[PDB]
Structure formats: C-alpha cells, structure tokens
C-alpha cells in the first residue's frame, strides 16, 4: 500500500 504517498501529503 502507498502510505507514504498519504502521509507525504501533510508536508505540503
């Protein structure tokens, strides 16, 4: 699963 393409979004 791409959790870190979710969890990058907060550093937008």
Same mark, same amino acid.
């Given at each position: 699963?791409r !959790?870190?393409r !979710?969890?990058?979004? %907060?550093? %937008?």
């Amino acid at each position: 699963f791409r !959790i870190m393409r !979710i969890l990058r979004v %907060l550093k %937008l």
